[PDB]
Design a binder for these strands. Structure first.
Length: 1326
RNA sequence: CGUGUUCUAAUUGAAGGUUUUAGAGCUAGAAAUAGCAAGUUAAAAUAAGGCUAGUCCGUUAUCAACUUGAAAAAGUGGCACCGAGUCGGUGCUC
DNA sequence: CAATACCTCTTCAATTAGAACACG
DNA sequence: TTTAGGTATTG
């Protein structure tokens, strides 16, 4: 006899219960525990609050790197293990000397100086080649034997840091000269293509190629230099091939198939020889000489210096920086010493001001220091050569910095190599392990192998050929690369929705193709002159057309049929077909695809050879690495000429199908012995579509379908919710609103409700790359014409101006950067149809009027003028595809009268499928009762209401939400949902198919939906009581019920429950604090003392415990009892529950009282003294938990006084609410005490309270608008939760935290249940 | 069916930052102090650690009390009416 | 004690898989 | 992307 209302969302999950008349009842429950109170009555409003759920993203961000770090120590390890045999004969302790190169002189067992022992020996390494790099170039450039321990230190130095693999292949260090080689590419080219020869033309191909300008702008600066060249020509594409890029020369060769090549890409040499063969191979020695430029070119940016002298540059490059720093160290120093030397210390002495030593000593970056001296060199004339060096960023540079991620591992491996080639003769074990040595650095576990699971890994994909230990030397054999390979991509794949044991075949499987072809033709009628009833195509008819026509052609047309087949062989001169549009929508393209490569049409049509054709397509779709694809394809290679294989690896498939294979041809009908395939083939008289086969009771198919949906019997609700997609913060709230339900039933005597109403409410760095890319492709200089930063792109008027390339969107003209206020932002889609602020709908144009009629998207006038202007942007990606489709709606037809009544539908009908699972789980869990017939029983009506429904209901009905007065409102939003949702299905039972879960004309559909919530309106002229005609049911009165909302809304008491969750996360702050004299620091490792070695700091504890015991005080060691809080941290937490006392006593507590060990999780709530309540923040911290119930008269006021969004109400009513705001003008001062009283009662914010007042009592002369939202600013103090600093309009108020947990313990502590109705109360005295 | 955003989840890799230690600091002076030469680099750890010792795992998710269970989760608390500062009373059941 | 105030790893790169959502 | 709990520091 009741209706439960619910309001879910990201953080809040409000609820409310309604009496038949929409009243909410007052019920009296018991109260457990020891306090004098044995029963307390509370009103049924149901409420909850909770922490925003955590994603798994940032957890993956660590879970990854922890495998990245530990394996980075396995790398340097295999160096030692191989080295530990010859290392021993040159030093006994050098290998343990890095092992303990962290500890202090005290704890450090072995000699302090690592490389040579005695400091005098080891100073020389530090003072001859201090930079490590200086060492590495020497061990390549010198042929004179040196210390093995020096050799290893260079080998580990590149393995620890190996470099990026975004460019794979081999480099030959003979891009010694870029300029000269080019004459050996062109020269190689000029001979190849005499008809148009080409000129060096005095070009500098180094400076005009190695300069740091854009990837595109350099071939430009080259082609302009070169004579008579196109860019997209064969040679401008090869100038674009060496600089790493995607350049398409097909237009020159007029190849049918596009071919964009890259050297960095894996399929470059295969992509070449399967392109080179297509051309004559004259083109090879034009090509591998282009590679030479890229290999020569690529090294350039890292080093612009001549490399003829140095075999190794990057290692060489940074020696460049030392002296480029060394000179500019003395120079700058000297320049301060010949002028201005009264501030020498701060730059050099002090590391806290961004001074250089601070720049080196202090934790300051390359950016900040450079920022510091920008005046200093600009107020110093001593150095002007340098000021240039700074602006380019080249000065006294660091040798470990951020841009050194652009370095390829092929010079790290390139300098590792020669050292082995330098000193292997004298060290025989080097050559015998050089491959091993290079195989650690060269190796990389690909993404698809999976972590080498030992079977003990949760995330582990890969199986193995053998069980012995995987090493980078025996990796290839041990793993099953394919077996591993399949798992990586198999797991994601969608399962059959009809069959969950059969995995789904790719989109391009023939059999899926056979179904797509067979079925579509299934429903075809054909008429001639002399047939009385148009008949279906029969078993022989259907088979033949496919047999000759479809294999034969990629698309099958209609007038193919009249002439190709009926006329050819059925012999109708003319025929009338009604099944299909102008061409069959179904293509055996996959069938078409095969022939080009296989070249044996009669092999495809062979039945025995079709399982290969289904295992090869799956093999091709699955993978994406051609080198890898070869493996699975040698299984069949004995069948084919080898030239097929080279072309067979080429075409790669993407996209997987919905439908399981066995279903297509394996689900057999016992009575009449055909598969789904066989059925679509021949049907006597009538050929069923697929959807018919699976739903005709006369066919056993569906009876064998139902057998697949149940088996397993679903999964438990926790298993179930987690699986469904969407926000992690929505699913964690999806789960709680059902536990609340099971109790809401459990409260009202397990009598299921009559209705359930549930509604769900609905970036700084990408905004600088969506723009940077386009104005490279769009080609403009508008970005360089005016620089802007990503710190300014959260205001759209500066955001859209650059997305529009500094030009209007409707009139074709430049725009001013500064007065972006006169310009007016416009919506591609009117707001009235649907509310949207998205950039895909947002745009900036000079005036709103120009686009078109307001009632429609911009009109035919502008799509003409501009369609071309909105192409390149789509073309350069500045706009987006969805944004465009609506942008050009003028010519389409536009928003028809059935279109505008479609968004108006979407506004008030929840089309969102994640609040359709929240619908389904409800009905199924509530209604387990079955009619004798197949039909179900629904004694609980599920309802979906959309935000706008209640969102409007308030501004028009005298009820205005204020989110920052209280945290009762989130629950209030369920009452309104409960009623209006039940006020609707009680007055319009027609709508039970778009408002209730469970199974042109639009010129009044517009009128049906835009009108429906009007029976709450007295005038517009409507009766005060409206009742449904059909059942005679009365479902509204505007005298009684409208007040029974206000009284349920006026209420002072509402259940608000911050959900008690145990905190779990990282141990402490990630930063590493220095060795300090406090016990607060946590040992980063067990064996290191934070007082000697430093460590992590300040972990928070998962749930605080209440310990009472006696602790020894003073010399006496006498023990006197105390009761306090020990918050258990998440590092001791794992060792706490194991034995609590044996742990607890280790921290000092003796004589410990066992049964009174009270675990108190986060957000725990105690009640003490005169009705004040508190929330446990932590062991030290309390949050402020006492709601202040806004009186109704006060609550309304905030929306009007604030006047949010200026005025959005009928202007005839803009008057009526205006006198009120000045009528109850003193309501202002009626808030202050009411505001104040809460502060004195519970908050104990007295110390800062005196300060809010002085700001208000001296701000009474300014207007209401300024003031209104500002008295709203202050409610964060009254709010639930932690205290936060807030500011009155011209002043800011600091927060007052709750530092101690002494106060709480004396007072009674309450465990409340999941809703707030069942309790357990305790008085904490003893 | 095609197209593209948005987000969700798993695998493989780079570059910083940081924490001690190794970079023989010197000259006066008893001495806290003041004078000057130096600085860019390397080692190593990057959640404690765990046992199943794998080149594995170690931050998601789930959490009233209470009874009972290894974990899952099953089980426990009258009805109504009049009122309204966070539940107060009344009447009945009991 | 609790009133005052500074502090909290970041920036990239490459590959798969799925819904949920909106256009032709 | 700014919260909100740890932590040395000051009147």
């Amino acid at each position: 006899k009741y209706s439960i209302g619910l309001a879910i969302g990201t953080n809040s999950v409000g609820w409310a219960v309604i009496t038949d008349e929409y009243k909410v009842p007052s019920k009296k429950f018991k109260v457990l525990g020891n306090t004098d109170r044995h029963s307390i009555k509370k009103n049924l409003i149901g409420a909850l609050l909770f922490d925003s759920g955590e994603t798994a993203e940032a957890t993956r961000l660590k879970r990854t790197a922890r495998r990245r770090y530990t394996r980075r120590k396995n790398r340097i390890c295999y160096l030692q293990e191989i080295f530990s045999n010859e290392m021993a004969k040159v030093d006994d302790s050098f290998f343990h000397r890095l092992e303990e190169s962290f500890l202090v002189e005290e704890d450090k067992k072995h000699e302090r100086h690592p490389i040579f022992g005695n400091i005098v020996d080891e100073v020389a390494y530090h003072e001859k080649y201090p930079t490590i790099y200086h060492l590495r170039k020497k061990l390549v450039d010198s042929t004179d034997k040196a210390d093995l321990r020096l050799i290893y230190l260079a080998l580990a130095h590149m393995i620890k840091f190996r470099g990026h693999f975004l460019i794979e292949g081999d480099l030959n260090p003979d891009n010694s000269d870029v300029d000269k080689l080019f004459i050996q590419l062109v020269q190689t080219y000029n001979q190849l293509f005499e008809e148009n020869p080409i000129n060096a033309s005095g070009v500098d191909a180094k400076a005009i190629l190695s300069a740091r300008l854009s990837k595109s702008r350099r071939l430009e600066n080259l082609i302009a230099q070169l004579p008579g060249e196109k860019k997209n020509g064969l040679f401008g594409n090869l100038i674009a091939l060496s600089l790493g890029l995607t350049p398409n020369f097909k237009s020159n060769f007029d190849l049918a198939e596009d071919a964009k090549l890259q050297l960095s890409k894996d399929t470059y040499d295969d992509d070449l020889d399967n392109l080179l063969a297509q051309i004559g191979d004259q083109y090879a020695d034009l090509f591998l000489a282009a590679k030479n430029l890229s290999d020569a070119i690529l090294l350039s940016d890292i080093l612009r210096v001549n490399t003829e002298i140095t075999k190794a540059p990057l290692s060489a490059s940074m020696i460049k920086r030392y002296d480029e720093h060394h000179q500019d160290l003395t120079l700058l120093k000297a320049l301060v010493r010949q002028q201005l030397p009264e501030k020498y210390k701060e730059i050099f002495f002090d590391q806290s001001k961004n001074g250089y030593a601070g720049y080196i000593d202090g934790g300051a970056s390359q950016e900040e220091f450079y920022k510091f001296i920008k005046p200093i060199l600009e107020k110093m004339d001593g150095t002007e050569e340098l000021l240039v060096k700074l602006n380019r960023e080249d000065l006294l540079r660091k040798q470990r910095t951020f841009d050194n991620g652009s370095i390829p591992h092929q010079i790290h491996l390139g300098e590792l190599h020669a050292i082995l080639r330098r000193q292997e003769d004298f060290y025989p074990f080097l050559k015998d392990n050089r491959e091993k040595i290079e195989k650690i650095l060269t190796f990389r576990i690909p993404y698809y192998v999976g972590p080498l699971a030992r079977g003990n890994s949760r995330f582990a994909w890969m199986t193995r050929k053998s069980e012995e230990t995987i090493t980078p030397w025996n990796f290839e054999e041990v793993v099953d690369k394919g077996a591993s390979a399949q798992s990586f991509i198999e797991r994601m794949t969608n399962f059959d929705k009809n069959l969950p044991n059969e995995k789904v075949l790719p989109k391009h499987s023939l059999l899926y193709e056979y179904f797509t072809v067979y079925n579509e033709l299934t429903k075809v009628k054909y008429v001639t002159e002399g047939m009385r009833k148009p008949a279906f195509l029969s078993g022989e008819q259907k088979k033949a057309i496919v047999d000759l026509l479809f294999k034969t052609n990629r698309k099958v047309t209609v007038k193919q049929l009249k002439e190709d087949y009926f006329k050819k062989i059925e012999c109708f001169d003319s025929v009338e077909i009604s099944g299909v549009e102008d061409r069959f929508n179904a293509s055996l393209g996959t069938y078409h695809d095969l022939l080009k490569i296989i070249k044996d049409k009669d092999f495809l049509d062979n039945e025995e050879n079709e399982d290969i054709l289904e295992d090869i397509v799956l093999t091709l779709t699955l993978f994406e690495d051609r080198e890898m694809i070869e493996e699975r394809l040698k299984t069949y290679a004995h069948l084919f000429d080898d030239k097929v294989m080279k072309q067979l690896k080429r075409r790669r498939y993407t996209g997987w199908g919905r439908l399981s294979r066995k279903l297509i041809n394996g689900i057999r009908d016992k009575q009449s012995g055909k598969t789904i395939l066989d059925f679509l083939k021949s049907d006597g008289f009538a050929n069923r579509n697929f959807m018919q086969l699976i739903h005709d009771d006369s066919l056993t198919f569906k009876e064998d379908i139902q057998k697949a949906q149940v088996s397993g019997q679903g999964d438990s609700l926790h298993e179930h919710i987690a699986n469904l997609a969407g926000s992690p913060a929505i699913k964690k709230g999806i789960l709680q609103t059902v536990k609340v339900v099971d109790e809401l039933v459990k409260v009202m005597g397990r009598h299921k409700p009559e209705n359930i109403v549930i509604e769900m409410a609905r970036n700084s760095r990408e905004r600088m790359k969506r723009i940077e890319e386009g104005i490279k492709e769009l080609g403009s200089q508008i970005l360089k014409e005016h620089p802007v930063e990503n710190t300014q792109l959260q205001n759209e008027k500066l955001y859209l101006y650059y997305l529009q390339n500094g030009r209007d969107m409707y009139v074709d003209q430049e725009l001013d950067i500064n007065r972006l206020s006169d310009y007016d932002v416009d919506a591609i889609v009117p707001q009235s149809f649907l509310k949207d602020d998205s950039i895909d709908n947002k745009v900036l144009t000079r005036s709103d009027k120009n686009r078109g009629k307001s009632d429609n998207v911009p009109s035919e006038e502008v799509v003409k003028k501009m369609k071309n202007y909105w192409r390149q942007l789509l073309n350069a990606k500045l706009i987006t595809q969805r944004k465009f489709d609506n942008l050009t709606k003028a010519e389409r037809g536009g928003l028809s009268e059935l279109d505008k009544a479609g968004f108006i539908k979407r506004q008030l009908v929840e089309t969102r499928q994640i609040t359709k699972h929240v619908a389904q789980i409800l009905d199924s869990r509530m209604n387990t009762k079955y009619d004798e017939n197949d039909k179900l029983i629904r004694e609980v009506k599920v309802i979906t209401l959309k935000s706008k429904l209640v969102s409007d209901f308030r501004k028009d009905f005298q009820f205005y939400k204020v989110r920052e007065i209280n945290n009762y409102h989130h629950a209030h939003d369920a009452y309104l949902n409960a009623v209006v949702g039940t006020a609707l299905i009680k007055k319009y039972p027609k709508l039970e198919s778009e408002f209730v879960y469970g199974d042109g004309k639009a010129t009044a559909k517009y009128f049906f939906y835009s009108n429906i919530m009007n029976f709450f309106k007295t005038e517009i002229k409507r009766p005060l009581i409206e009742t449904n005609g059909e059942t005679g049911e009365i479902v509204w009165d505007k005298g009684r019920d409208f007040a029974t909302v206000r009284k349920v809304l006026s209420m002072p008491q509402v259940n608000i429950v911050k959900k008690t969750e145990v905190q779990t996360g990282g141990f402490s702050k990630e930063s590493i604090l220095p060795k300090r004299n406090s016990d607060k620091l946590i040992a980063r490792k067990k064996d290191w003392d934070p007082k000697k070695y430093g460590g992590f700091d300040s972990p928070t504890v998962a749930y605080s415990v209440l310990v009472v015991a006696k602790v020894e005080k003073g010399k006496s060691k006498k023990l006197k009892s105390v009761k306090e809080l020990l918050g258990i941290t998440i590092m001791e937490r794992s060792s706490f529950e194991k034995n609590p006392i044996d742990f607890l006593e280790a921290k000092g507590y003796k004589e410990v009282k066992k049964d009174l060990i009270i675990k108190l999780p986060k957000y725990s709530l105690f009640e003490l003294e005169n009705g004040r309540k508190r929330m446990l923040a932590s062991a030290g911290e309390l949050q402020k938990g006492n709601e202040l119930a806004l009186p109704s008269k006060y609550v309304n006021f905030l929306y009007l006084a604030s006047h949010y969004e200026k005025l959005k109400g009928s202007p005839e009513d803009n008057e009526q609410k205006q006198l009120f705001v000045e009528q109850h003008k003193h309501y202002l001062d009626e808030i202050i005490e009411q505001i104040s009283e809460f502060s004195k009662r519970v908050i104990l914010a007295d110390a800062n309270l005196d300060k809010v007042l002085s700001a208000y009592n001296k701000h009474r002369d300014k207007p209401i608008r300024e003031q209104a939202e500002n008295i709203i600013h202050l409610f964060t103090l009254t709010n639930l939760g932690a205290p936060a600093a807030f500011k009155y309009f011209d002043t800011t108020i600091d927060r007052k935290r709750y530092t101690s947990t002494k106060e709480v313990l004396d007072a009674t502590l309450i465990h409340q249940s999941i809703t707030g109705l069942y309790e357990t109360r305790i008085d904490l005295s003893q």
